[PDB]
Amino acid sequence: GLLDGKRILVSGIITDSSIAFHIARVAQEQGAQLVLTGFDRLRLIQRITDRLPAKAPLLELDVQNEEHLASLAGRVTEAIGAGNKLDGVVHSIGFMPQTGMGINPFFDAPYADVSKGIHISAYSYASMAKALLPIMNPGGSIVGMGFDPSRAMPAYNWMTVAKSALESVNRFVAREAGKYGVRSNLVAAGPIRTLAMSAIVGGALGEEAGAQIQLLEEGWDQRAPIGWNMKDATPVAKTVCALLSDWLPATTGDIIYADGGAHTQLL
Amino acid sequence: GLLDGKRILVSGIITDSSIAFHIARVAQEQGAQLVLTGFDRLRLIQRITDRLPAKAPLLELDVQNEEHLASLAGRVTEAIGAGNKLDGVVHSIGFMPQTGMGINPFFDAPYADVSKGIHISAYSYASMAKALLPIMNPGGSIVGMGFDPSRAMPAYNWMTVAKSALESVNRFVAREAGKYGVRSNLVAAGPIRTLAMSAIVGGALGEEAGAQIQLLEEGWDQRAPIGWNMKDATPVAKTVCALLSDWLPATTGDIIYADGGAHTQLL
Amino acid sequence: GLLDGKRILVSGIITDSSIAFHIARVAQEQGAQLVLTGFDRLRLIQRITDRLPAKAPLLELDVQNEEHLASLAGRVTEAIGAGNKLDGVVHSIGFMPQTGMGINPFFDAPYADVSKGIHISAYSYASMAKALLPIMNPGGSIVGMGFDPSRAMPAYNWMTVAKSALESVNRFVAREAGKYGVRSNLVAAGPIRTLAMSAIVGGALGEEAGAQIQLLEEGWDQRAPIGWNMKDATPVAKTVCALLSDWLPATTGDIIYADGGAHTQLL
Amino acid sequence: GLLDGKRILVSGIITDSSIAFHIARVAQEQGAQLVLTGFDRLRLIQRITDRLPAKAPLLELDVQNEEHLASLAGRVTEAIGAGNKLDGVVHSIGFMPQTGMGINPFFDAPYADVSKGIHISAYSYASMAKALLPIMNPGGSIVGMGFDPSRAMPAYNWMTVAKSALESVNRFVAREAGKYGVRSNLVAAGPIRTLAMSAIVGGALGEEAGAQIQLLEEGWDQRAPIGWNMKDATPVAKTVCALLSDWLPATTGDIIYADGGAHTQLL
Ligand SMILES: NC(=O)C1=CN([C@@H]2O[C@H](COP(=O)(O)OP(=O)(O)OC[C@H]3O[C@@H](n4cnc5c(N)ncnc54)[C@H](O)[C@@H]3O)[C@@H](O)[C@H]2O)C=CC1
Ligand SMILES: NC(=O)C1=CN([C@@H]2O[C@H](COP(=O)(O)OP(=O)(O)OC[C@H]3O[C@@H](n4cnc5c(N)ncnc54)[C@H](O)[C@@H]3O)[C@@H](O)[C@H]2O)C=CC1
Ligand SMILES: NC(=O)C1=CN([C@@H]2O[C@H](COP(=O)(O)OP(=O)(O)OC[C@H]3O[C@@H](n4cnc5c(N)ncnc54)[C@H](O)[C@@H]3O)[C@@H](O)[C@H]2O)C=CC1
Ligand SMILES: NC(=O)C1=CN([C@@H]2O[C@H](COP(=O)(O)OP(=O)(O)OC[C@H]3O[C@@H](n4cnc5c(N)ncnc54)[C@H](O)[C@@H]3O)[C@@H](O)[C@H]2O)C=CC1
């Protein structure tokens, strides 16, 4: 069991096709005891998570809520029992109001909307770390979910800016986390057919967005020297588990690309 | 005259040691007619700018003000006369509340403070572009001021996150600006002894910040194969002018490092 | 056992402080059956490898020898028995004549000497892949050893050029290897006290080299948010094993930094 | 005149569609006195260069010839007159035997052929610098021609490896050149329809190469936010001249992308 004995907080389960859902599953299959957090439809999330191969306490956490962040460590040690600490934290949380993604022209997202997306998608990586490093073991691992934002791309727009900010935050959380003996890294994932992703290629945010995203994903699989299957989140899940394991013990402030190799190839 | 005939909006003059101040000066020495914008002490800025080798209208612009952004193009064509357009825009604007720079631990900047810095230092690059591309000529150039945020560094903290977001914004403004025949680029500058920079090495934001920044700059000059003189902004000024010229006509969404070569060298 | 059942060719064992030595050891501790290759002192290597926690056939391979490359696949399937294939190949081979490292000024390495180092240290990664992909399983993994060559550094000189070429070769072997269902990646390691490394800080290649390398390594541990211990190769060993495992199944043409996080940090 | 008064050695003119040809032309139009070097058809090159807007001495230089390198500085000061030095050197030289480009599979280039291409296309950048820095002024500029080798691409194959090595060499020549007050940089150009380029899209090196290159170039113009015209070398020429000028005085060991902005954009 890659993750035998480890206690791991996995955030961001919203449906059974969330990337966190699969991380959660592969983690349990691998020996880990989890605690889960969820955003706003908690009953829905409870019903979804009932399907993991094992039970796991579930706590509410709205990353924009000071008080939830304040109480989080208490709620976690309670759920895992006093005298116990986390070995692993997964941040798999993201959001950008739709005015910052694809419908709208890039220049028409208003600041209050982008600030919200940066808050939830980038800054919150620091918040979770701050809230949780006090309850983590030496040898621990924080892992966040990004996508390669180093070139601009159609439709993703401000969400790419948010991911750029996230990569930079991650390099700073690594500085803090290191004082605890704790690694911090991002997994840069290829596009994965989430419920929201599907809704977008179905045109949820306008037709030209839809067509652009669709063209983006097909290009991925073509460049990926080992292919990319957007229908299958589990190679990303496995990658996160590798970073939660003790098998990358000298990597931090870093980015692991689970993307089929697509970013290393031009045509 | 590198810039003969060009009309250029240069933002961000606050003292005679602002980097915009020198860009302004080198630009005039080079043939350009400028319009200047300033933030909040306009009388102060007027008195400062009186010293440039030529007169230049001065307009108020608070990058967080919708109405200033709204009116900006009107105020500019008025100042340069109807039927005239800009060839050049300089964004040399930045700010991060001090809770996000160095005193404070990284995890204690509150979101409202970082959001403010991201607003002024990153998002505003899109705002200026949006406000001004309607009044720019084919062959034009937007240039913003950054610093290399690809590795974390002590004290700069959230300001580095903000610069990471800026680089990503710049790649998107390039997409928009290209429809107008207009380039967008950043100059990544080495550390330069601005009034605020000095105040910080003098300990304005705590002693350990001060010492860290001071150590940062000395490392710069040591790595720079051609040296780096933080007392002298004019090699950065000249670099911005090169991007305003027609001599980099195939570069955009890009980053030019005016940093003595320091980023290309490890020890 | 991370590597249970896998058959793995590990090249480059020359002493018990070679990085391959530890990869070999951690791999065996982890379930793998190995075949080993060695360069020129085969009796010496046999005596060294006798110390691994398990036996492993040992084959001669001089990466500059056409005939050794020609025969290699035969010799390997013989050693592992017909009808069996490799799951894993480790390239941990490197060399640059000393005229290209540190004594000599950079401009005085003669081409014939640099060509030799590029041959052994970069091109040979393609050669091993070519010689061995015919005997590898879907799901396999080729892993080479590099160091981050993206900034120039004192003394390493042409060896850095060679590592730059290696990273680029690796992106091409990924293209080929993918047709076999096989990943190709590099581990970028922090400096590790090998016999040759020690000899150099002891001044083997001149005093100023020695002092520069020594300054390089101390800077590493200072930047590394989780520290770097050049005396201990085993975090690199573990990283290579992670890439040999099935836990990074969507990464290829890529670079994993086992370097304590040092490359993500400026000061 | 951007380059008024400067003396500049421009290498690599072979036809009137060579990139050096246009650099040469734009440089003269801009005030510079040139000395030119040529590889092996000197009479041909003389007849070609007769067309520049001004005369320029022409010297033979085969970058693989020790004796030509040995004598080069003598021949140059002779041609420019004793007591005079160079302000500018252009390296616009490249070659990879066709076994390393596109016909052949990547694994079938033999080392002796790749070594040749690395010799001419990468190592020679150090050679020219070594041969010429002794006859350069403070404030001088060495400029080489590359293409972005950071992702693998079809057909270019070993020539991409060679360009990877070149970028790394350039970071080392910057270290040496800095002791003379001299900058070293590369221009990364978009694809440009040279005679050899045309021959290749015409299938000179096999049909699938041809089709791949052709697909590569069309993708360039599509990503380039300001377009890319492979028929027109003069935006690259202008970029090189910008680096020869005094307008990028703090950039070295660096890479300027004259590529329409294509590398900053994913789809
Ligand atoms: N699906 C894709 O193609 C890729 C997604 N990613 C990233 O993976 C992560 C997970 O998203 P997916 O699983 O793809 O979609 P998802 O929609 O299943 O996950 C988004 C999670 O963010 C949570 N969330 C939103 N606002 C929140 C708040 N205020 N507090 C707490 N949680 C909040 C949602 O509840 C949801 O569980 C995101 O960072 C996404 O950007 C990275 C690469 C690719
Ligand atoms: N000084 C340094 O070592 C380096 C500075 N930079 C960047 O150069 C740019 C200029 O800063 P410096 O000249 O160094 O300092 P400075 O303090 O002279 O310039 C800052 C400018 O931002 C303006 N500003 C702040 N808030 C504003 C708002 N709401 N609206 C409009 N303007 C506002 C200020 O009025 C000031 O003119 C900034 O982007 C800075 O981050 C980049 C590299 C190095
Ligand atoms: N030690 C260090 O600080 C770092 C080393 N690396 C790389 O790790 C790899 C292994 O080197 P170390 O274990 O450090 O030193 P080492 O000297 O123990 O390993 C070098 C291996 O290359 C082999 N070799 C040399 N010429 C050969 C040829 N013609 N054919 C076959 N093999 C040949 C040697 O026999 C030796 O086994 C090299 O790629 C090195 O550049 C990467 C990062 C750091
Ligand atoms: N054409 C393209 O799409 C791009 C070309 N480049 C680079 O621009 C540079 C110039 O090539 P182009 O003008 O495109 O082609 P070209 O064929 O006109 O120039 C090649 C030059 O290399 C010279 N050369 C070859 N072997 C030599 C030797 N032993 N000694 C001295 N010179 C030798 C040739 O004589 C020729 O003048 C090369 O570095 C090329 O890789 C960079 C980006 C794009």
Side-chain angles (χ1 to χ4, degrees), chain A residues 171 178 225 238 246-247 250-251 253-254 256-257 259-260 263-265, chain C residues 171 175 178 225 238 246-247 250-251 253-254 256-257 259-260 263-265:
Chain A
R171 277 165 220 139
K238 285 181 69 183
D246 310 313
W247 295 94
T251 295
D254 221 331
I256 304 262
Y257 293 90
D259 74 331
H263 76 121
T264 67
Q265 305 286 330
Chain C
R171 277 165 220 139
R175 289 179 73 84
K238 285 181 69 183
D246 310 313
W247 295 94
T251 295
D254 221 331
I256 304 262
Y257 293 90
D259 74 331
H263 76 121
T264 67
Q265 305 286 330

mmCIF file of all heavy atoms in Angstrom, chain A residues 171 178 225 238 246-247 250-251 253-254 256-257 259-260 263-265, chain C residues 171 175 178 225 238 246-247 250-251 253-254 256-257 259-260 263-265:
data_model
loop_
_atom_site.group_PDB
_atom_site.id
_atom_site.type_symbol
_atom_site.label_atom_id
_atom_site.label_comp_id
_atom_site.label_asym_id
_atom_site.label_seq_id
_atom_site.Cartn_x
_atom_site.Cartn_y
_atom_site.Cartn_z
ATOM 1 N N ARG A 171 5.514 28.198 -4.576
ATOM 2 C CA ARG A 171 6.948 28.257 -4.283
ATOM 3 C C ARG A 171 7.161 28.871 -2.877
ATOM 4 O O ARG A 171 8.058 28.455 -2.142
ATOM 5 C CB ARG A 171 7.674 29.056 -5.297
ATOM 6 C CG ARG A 171 8.060 28.331 -6.585
ATOM 7 C CD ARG A 171 8.428 29.432 -7.575
ATOM 8 N NE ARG A 171 7.859 28.916 -8.752
ATOM 9 C CZ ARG A 171 7.200 29.576 -9.677
ATOM 10 N NH1 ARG A 171 6.987 30.876 -9.641
ATOM 11 N NH2 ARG A 171 6.740 28.836 -10.663
ATOM 12 N N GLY A 178 8.648 23.947 4.708
ATOM 13 C CA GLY A 178 9.935 23.262 4.978
ATOM 14 C C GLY A 178 10.388 23.306 6.464
ATOM 15 O O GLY A 178 11.039 22.396 6.951
ATOM 16 N N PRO A 225 3.279 12.149 -26.159
ATOM 17 C CA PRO A 225 3.860 10.914 -26.678
ATOM 18 C C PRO A 225 3.282 9.597 -26.100
ATOM 19 O O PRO A 225 3.628 8.513 -26.575
ATOM 20 C CB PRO A 225 5.343 11.043 -26.306
ATOM 21 C CG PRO A 225 5.574 12.530 -26.129
ATOM 22 C CD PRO A 225 4.281 13.018 -25.518
ATOM 23 N N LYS A 238 -3.013 9.094 -9.617
ATOM 24 C CA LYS A 238 -1.930 8.254 -9.189
ATOM 25 C C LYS A 238 -0.707 9.138 -8.942
ATOM 26 O O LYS A 238 0.162 8.831 -8.095
ATOM 27 C CB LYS A 238 -1.653 7.160 -10.211
ATOM 28 C CG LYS A 238 -2.718 6.060 -10.177
ATOM 29 C CD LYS A 238 -2.451 4.935 -11.180
ATOM 30 C CE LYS A 238 -1.245 4.149 -10.750
ATOM 31 N NZ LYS A 238 -0.933 3.088 -11.747
ATOM 32 N N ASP A 246 6.367 8.617 0.128
ATOM 33 C CA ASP A 246 7.718 8.992 0.535
ATOM 34 C C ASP A 246 8.640 8.769 -0.618
ATOM 35 O O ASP A 246 9.847 8.667 -0.395
ATOM 36 C CB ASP A 246 8.292 8.026 1.610
ATOM 37 C CG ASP A 246 7.361 7.785 2.769
ATOM 38 O OD1 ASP A 246 6.788 8.749 3.325
ATOM 39 O OD2 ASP A 246 7.224 6.612 3.167
ATOM 40 N N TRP A 247 8.108 8.588 -1.829
ATOM 41 C CA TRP A 247 8.988 8.302 -2.948
ATOM 42 C C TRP A 247 9.499 9.494 -3.754
ATOM 43 O O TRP A 247 10.394 9.324 -4.595
ATOM 44 C CB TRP A 247 8.377 7.234 -3.809
ATOM 45 C CG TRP A 247 8.328 6.005 -3.019
ATOM 46 C CD1 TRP A 247 7.256 5.507 -2.243
ATOM 47 C CD2 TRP A 247 9.439 5.088 -2.812
ATOM 48 N NE1 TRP A 247 7.657 4.341 -1.592
ATOM 49 C CE2 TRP A 247 8.956 4.049 -1.890
ATOM 50 C CE3 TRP A 247 10.737 5.020 -3.296
ATOM 51 C CZ2 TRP A 247 9.751 3.021 -1.476
ATOM 52 C CZ3 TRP A 247 11.543 3.961 -2.882
ATOM 53 C CH2 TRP A 247 11.046 2.963 -2.002
ATOM 54 N N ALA A 250 12.730 14.522 -2.021
ATOM 55 C CA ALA A 250 13.554 15.693 -2.225
ATOM 56 C C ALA A 250 12.973 16.679 -3.254
ATOM 57 O O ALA A 250 13.770 17.411 -3.930
ATOM 58 C CB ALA A 250 14.954 15.257 -2.707
ATOM 59 N N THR A 251 11.638 16.687 -3.431
ATOM 60 C CA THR A 251 11.008 17.565 -4.425
ATOM 61 C C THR A 251 10.082 18.488 -3.674
ATOM 62 O O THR A 251 9.261 18.023 -2.910
ATOM 63 C CB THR A 251 10.222 16.708 -5.443
ATOM 64 O OG1 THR A 251 11.143 15.888 -6.173
ATOM 65 C CG2 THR A 251 9.435 17.561 -6.496
ATOM 66 N N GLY A 253 8.304 22.898 -3.657
ATOM 67 C CA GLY A 253 8.153 24.114 -4.417
ATOM 68 C C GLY A 253 8.019 23.839 -5.915
ATOM 69 O O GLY A 253 8.069 24.757 -6.725
ATOM 70 N N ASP A 254 7.838 22.564 -6.253
ATOM 71 C CA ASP A 254 7.883 22.062 -7.626
ATOM 72 C C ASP A 254 6.534 21.710 -8.333
ATOM 73 O O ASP A 254 5.397 21.867 -7.776
ATOM 74 C CB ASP A 254 8.896 20.942 -7.735
ATOM 75 C CG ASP A 254 9.676 21.049 -8.990
ATOM 76 O OD1 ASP A 254 9.157 21.589 -10.033
ATOM 77 O OD2 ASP A 254 10.829 20.629 -8.952
ATOM 78 N N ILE A 256 4.807 18.826 -10.941
ATOM 79 C CA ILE A 256 4.854 17.514 -11.669
ATOM 80 C C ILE A 256 3.748 17.500 -12.703
ATOM 81 O O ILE A 256 2.607 17.873 -12.403
ATOM 82 C CB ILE A 256 4.686 16.323 -10.712
ATOM 83 C CG1 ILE A 256 5.773 16.434 -9.632
ATOM 84 C CG2 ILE A 256 4.696 14.999 -11.487
ATOM 85 C CD1 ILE A 256 6.935 15.557 -9.950
ATOM 86 N N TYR A 257 4.120 17.177 -13.927
ATOM 87 C CA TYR A 257 3.203 17.296 -15.059
ATOM 88 C C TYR A 257 2.624 15.903 -15.283
ATOM 89 O O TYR A 257 3.355 14.916 -15.589
ATOM 90 C CB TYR A 257 3.960 17.824 -16.299
ATOM 91 C CG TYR A 257 4.425 19.248 -16.118
ATOM 92 C CD1 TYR A 257 5.685 19.522 -15.560
ATOM 93 C CD2 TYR A 257 3.575 20.341 -16.452
ATOM 94 C CE1 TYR A 257 6.116 20.820 -15.384
ATOM 95 C CE2 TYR A 257 3.981 21.634 -16.265
ATOM 96 C CZ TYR A 257 5.272 21.871 -15.724
ATOM 97 O OH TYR A 257 5.723 23.170 -15.537
ATOM 98 N N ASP A 259 0.310 14.831 -17.787
ATOM 99 C CA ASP A 259 -0.340 15.561 -18.896
ATOM 100 C C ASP A 259 -0.014 14.779 -20.152
ATOM 101 O O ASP A 259 -0.077 15.294 -21.249
ATOM 102 C CB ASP A 259 0.215 17.015 -18.979
ATOM 103 C CG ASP A 259 1.660 17.069 -19.567
ATOM 104 O OD1 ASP A 259 2.460 16.064 -19.395
ATOM 105 O OD2 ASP A 259 1.993 18.108 -20.230
ATOM 106 N N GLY A 260 0.485 13.570 -19.953
ATOM 107 C CA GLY A 260 0.825 12.708 -21.060
ATOM 108 C C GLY A 260 2.076 13.107 -21.732
ATOM 109 O O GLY A 260 2.512 12.435 -22.690
ATOM 110 N N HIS A 263 3.203 18.811 -22.702
ATOM 111 C CA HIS A 263 3.948 20.117 -22.615
ATOM 112 C C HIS A 263 5.363 20.013 -23.085
ATOM 113 O O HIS A 263 5.979 21.022 -23.323
ATOM 114 C CB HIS A 263 3.959 20.737 -21.202
ATOM 115 C CG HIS A 263 4.918 20.051 -20.234
ATOM 116 N ND1 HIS A 263 5.946 20.712 -19.621
ATOM 117 C CD2 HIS A 263 4.984 18.741 -19.788
ATOM 118 C CE1 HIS A 263 6.616 19.868 -18.824
ATOM 119 N NE2 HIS A 263 6.044 18.658 -18.926
ATOM 120 N N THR A 264 5.925 18.829 -23.231
ATOM 121 C CA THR A 264 7.281 18.804 -23.728
ATOM 122 C C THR A 264 7.422 18.790 -25.281
ATOM 123 O O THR A 264 8.563 18.501 -25.824
ATOM 124 C CB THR A 264 7.946 17.516 -23.267
ATOM 125 O OG1 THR A 264 7.311 16.397 -23.913
ATOM 126 C CG2 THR A 264 7.857 17.404 -21.763
ATOM 127 N N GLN A 265 6.308 19.002 -26.006
ATOM 128 C CA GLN A 265 6.322 18.677 -27.460
ATOM 129 C C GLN A 265 5.657 19.792 -28.239
ATOM 130 O O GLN A 265 4.629 20.314 -27.829
ATOM 131 C CB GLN A 265 5.591 17.350 -27.748
ATOM 132 C CG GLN A 265 6.089 16.143 -26.961
ATOM 133 C CD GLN A 265 7.426 15.609 -27.458
ATOM 134 O OE1 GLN A 265 7.744 15.719 -28.625
ATOM 135 N NE2 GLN A 265 8.250 15.070 -26.539
ATOM 136 N N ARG C 171 13.716 14.665 -24.665
ATOM 137 C CA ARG C 171 12.377 14.977 -25.169
ATOM 138 C C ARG C 171 12.115 14.171 -26.466
ATOM 139 O O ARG C 171 10.996 13.714 -26.705
ATOM 140 C CB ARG C 171 12.223 16.425 -25.435
ATOM 141 C CG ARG C 171 11.876 17.304 -24.235
ATOM 142 C CD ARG C 171 12.153 18.734 -24.687
ATOM 143 N NE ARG C 171 12.725 19.265 -23.519
ATOM 144 C CZ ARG C 171 13.758 20.072 -23.429
ATOM 145 N NH1 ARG C 171 14.419 20.536 -24.470
ATOM 146 N NH2 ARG C 171 14.109 20.386 -22.200
ATOM 147 N N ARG C 175 9.388 10.707 -27.600
ATOM 148 C CA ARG C 175 8.645 10.492 -28.831
ATOM 149 C C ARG C 175 8.768 9.036 -29.274
ATOM 150 O O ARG C 175 7.748 8.401 -29.432
ATOM 151 C CB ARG C 175 9.154 11.409 -29.946
ATOM 152 C CG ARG C 175 8.789 12.865 -29.751
ATOM 153 C CD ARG C 175 9.387 13.662 -30.919
ATOM 154 N NE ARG C 175 8.697 13.476 -32.212
ATOM 155 C CZ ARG C 175 7.605 14.174 -32.554
ATOM 156 N NH1 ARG C 175 7.077 15.093 -31.730
ATOM 157 N NH2 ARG C 175 7.036 13.981 -33.733
ATOM 158 N N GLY C 178 7.379 6.332 -26.781
ATOM 159 C CA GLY C 178 5.904 6.281 -26.632
ATOM 160 C C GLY C 178 5.199 5.248 -27.555
ATOM 161 O O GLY C 178 4.174 4.688 -27.204
ATOM 162 N N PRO C 225 14.366 24.489 0.464
ATOM 163 C CA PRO C 225 13.495 24.585 1.631
ATOM 164 C C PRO C 225 13.416 23.321 2.524
ATOM 165 O O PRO C 225 12.804 23.361 3.593
ATOM 166 C CB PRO C 225 12.121 24.881 1.017
ATOM 167 C CG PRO C 225 12.419 25.473 -0.345
ATOM 168 C CD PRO C 225 13.643 24.714 -0.801
ATOM 169 N N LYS C 238 15.498 7.276 -4.533
ATOM 170 C CA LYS C 238 14.119 6.952 -4.298
ATOM 171 C C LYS C 238 13.282 7.587 -5.411
ATOM 172 O O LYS C 238 12.206 7.076 -5.792
ATOM 173 C CB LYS C 238 13.681 7.411 -2.915
ATOM 174 C CG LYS C 238 14.235 6.509 -1.809
ATOM 175 C CD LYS C 238 13.791 6.935 -0.408
ATOM 176 C CE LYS C 238 12.320 6.679 -0.243
ATOM 177 N NZ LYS C 238 11.855 7.144 1.093
ATOM 178 N N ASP C 246 4.784 2.513 -11.293
ATOM 179 C CA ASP C 246 3.611 2.839 -12.099
ATOM 180 C C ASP C 246 2.934 4.025 -11.495
ATOM 181 O O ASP C 246 1.756 4.239 -11.782
ATOM 182 C CB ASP C 246 2.513 1.743 -12.000
ATOM 183 C CG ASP C 246 3.027 0.346 -12.227
ATOM 184 O OD1 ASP C 246 3.784 0.104 -13.193
ATOM 185 O OD2 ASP C 246 2.638 -0.547 -11.448
ATOM 186 N N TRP C 247 3.603 4.743 -10.590
ATOM 187 C CA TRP C 247 2.934 5.857 -9.943
ATOM 188 C C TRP C 247 3.076 7.230 -10.598
ATOM 189 O O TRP C 247 2.379 8.173 -10.197
ATOM 190 C CB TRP C 247 3.276 5.870 -8.481
ATOM 191 C CG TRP C 247 2.706 4.664 -7.884
ATOM 192 C CD1 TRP C 247 3.333 3.416 -7.665
ATOM 193 C CD2 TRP C 247 1.319 4.499 -7.475
ATOM 194 N NE1 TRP C 247 2.406 2.516 -7.140
ATOM 195 C CE2 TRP C 247 1.184 3.108 -7.013
ATOM 196 C CE3 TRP C 247 0.219 5.342 -7.432
ATOM 197 C CZ2 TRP C 247 0.000 2.609 -6.556
ATOM 198 C CZ3 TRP C 247 -0.987 4.832 -6.952
ATOM 199 C CH2 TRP C 247 -1.086 3.489 -6.499
ATOM 200 N N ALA C 250 1.628 9.204 -16.319
ATOM 201 C CA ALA C 250 1.352 10.187 -17.343
ATOM 202 C C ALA C 250 2.455 11.251 -17.481
ATOM 203 O O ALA C 250 2.143 12.419 -17.888
ATOM 204 C CB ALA C 250 0.024 10.904 -17.021
ATOM 205 N N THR C 251 3.705 10.911 -17.115
ATOM 206 C CA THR C 251 4.806 11.881 -17.174
ATOM 207 C C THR C 251 5.828 11.332 -18.137
ATOM 208 O O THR C 251 6.242 10.199 -17.992
ATOM 209 C CB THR C 251 5.418 12.051 -15.765
ATOM 210 O OG1 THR C 251 4.434 12.626 -14.895
ATOM 211 C CG2 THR C 251 6.664 13.000 -15.738
ATOM 212 N N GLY C 253 9.052 12.604 -21.392
ATOM 213 C CA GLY C 253 9.794 13.707 -21.952
ATOM 214 C C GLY C 253 10.127 14.765 -20.900
ATOM 215 O O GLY C 253 10.587 15.851 -21.232
ATOM 216 N N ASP C 254 9.894 14.416 -19.637
ATOM 217 C CA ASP C 254 9.956 15.338 -18.503
ATOM 218 C C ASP C 254 11.198 15.268 -17.556
ATOM 219 O O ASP C 254 12.170 14.463 -17.745
ATOM 220 C CB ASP C 254 8.650 15.305 -17.739
ATOM 221 C CG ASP C 254 8.244 16.668 -17.320
ATOM 222 O OD1 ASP C 254 9.130 17.570 -17.098
ATOM 223 O OD2 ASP C 254 7.037 16.874 -17.237
ATOM 224 N N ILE C 256 12.251 15.506 -13.441
ATOM 225 C CA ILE C 256 11.879 15.543 -11.987
ATOM 226 C C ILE C 256 13.094 15.979 -11.194
ATOM 227 O O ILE C 256 14.202 15.479 -11.421
ATOM 228 C CB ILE C 256 11.395 14.173 -11.485
ATOM 229 C CG1 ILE C 256 10.226 13.735 -12.378
ATOM 230 C CG2 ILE C 256 11.063 14.230 -9.988
ATOM 231 C CD1 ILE C 256 8.916 14.036 -11.732
ATOM 232 N N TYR C 257 12.893 16.978 -10.354
ATOM 233 C CA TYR C 257 14.004 17.622 -9.656
ATOM 234 C C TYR C 257 14.066 16.981 -8.274
ATOM 235 O O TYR C 257 13.105 17.066 -7.455
ATOM 236 C CB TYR C 257 13.770 19.148 -9.587
ATOM 237 C CG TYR C 257 13.833 19.796 -10.949
ATOM 238 C CD1 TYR C 257 12.675 19.921 -11.733
ATOM 239 C CD2 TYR C 257 15.074 20.239 -11.489
ATOM 240 C CE1 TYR C 257 12.723 20.505 -12.981
ATOM 241 C CE2 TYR C 257 15.141 20.803 -12.734
ATOM 242 C CZ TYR C 257 13.944 20.937 -13.486
ATOM 243 O OH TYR C 257 13.973 21.519 -14.745
ATOM 244 N N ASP C 259 16.294 17.715 -5.578
ATOM 245 C CA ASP C 259 17.382 18.708 -5.449
ATOM 246 C C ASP C 259 17.062 19.513 -4.207
ATOM 247 O O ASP C 259 17.537 20.616 -4.032
ATOM 248 C CB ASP C 259 17.429 19.618 -6.714
ATOM 249 C CG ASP C 259 16.261 20.653 -6.746
ATOM 250 O OD1 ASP C 259 15.133 20.364 -6.181
ATOM 251 O OD2 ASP C 259 16.479 21.776 -7.314
ATOM 252 N N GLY C 260 16.125 19.001 -3.426
ATOM 253 C CA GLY C 260 15.732 19.655 -2.200
ATOM 254 C C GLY C 260 14.884 20.840 -2.430
ATOM 255 O O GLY C 260 14.442 21.489 -1.460
ATOM 256 N N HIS C 263 16.156 24.556 -6.826
ATOM 257 C CA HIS C 263 15.941 25.332 -8.099
ATOM 258 C C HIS C 263 14.718 26.190 -8.059
ATOM 259 O O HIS C 263 14.578 27.055 -8.888
ATOM 260 C CB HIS C 263 15.863 24.449 -9.362
ATOM 261 C CG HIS C 263 14.540 23.705 -9.517
ATOM 262 N ND1 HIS C 263 13.722 23.870 -10.600
ATOM 263 C CD2 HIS C 263 13.907 22.788 -8.693
ATOM 264 C CE1 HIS C 263 12.639 23.091 -10.472
ATOM 265 N NE2 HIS C 263 12.735 22.433 -9.306
ATOM 266 N N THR C 264 13.804 25.995 -7.127
ATOM 267 C CA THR C 264 12.669 26.889 -7.125
ATOM 268 C C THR C 264 12.860 28.208 -6.315
ATOM 269 O O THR C 264 11.834 28.943 -6.027
ATOM 270 C CB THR C 264 11.498 26.188 -6.453
ATOM 271 O OG1 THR C 264 11.799 25.993 -5.059
ATOM 272 C CG2 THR C 264 11.224 24.872 -7.144
ATOM 273 N N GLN C 265 14.100 28.487 -5.870
ATOM 274 C CA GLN C 265 14.271 29.542 -4.832
ATOM 275 C C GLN C 265 15.445 30.427 -5.192
ATOM 276 O O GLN C 265 16.484 29.943 -5.624
ATOM 277 C CB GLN C 265 14.509 28.926 -3.437
ATOM 278 C CG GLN C 265 13.450 27.933 -2.972
ATOM 279 C CD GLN C 265 12.147 28.596 -2.548
ATOM 280 O OE1 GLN C 265 12.142 29.717 -2.082
ATOM 281 N NE2 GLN C 265 11.009 27.907 -2.767
#
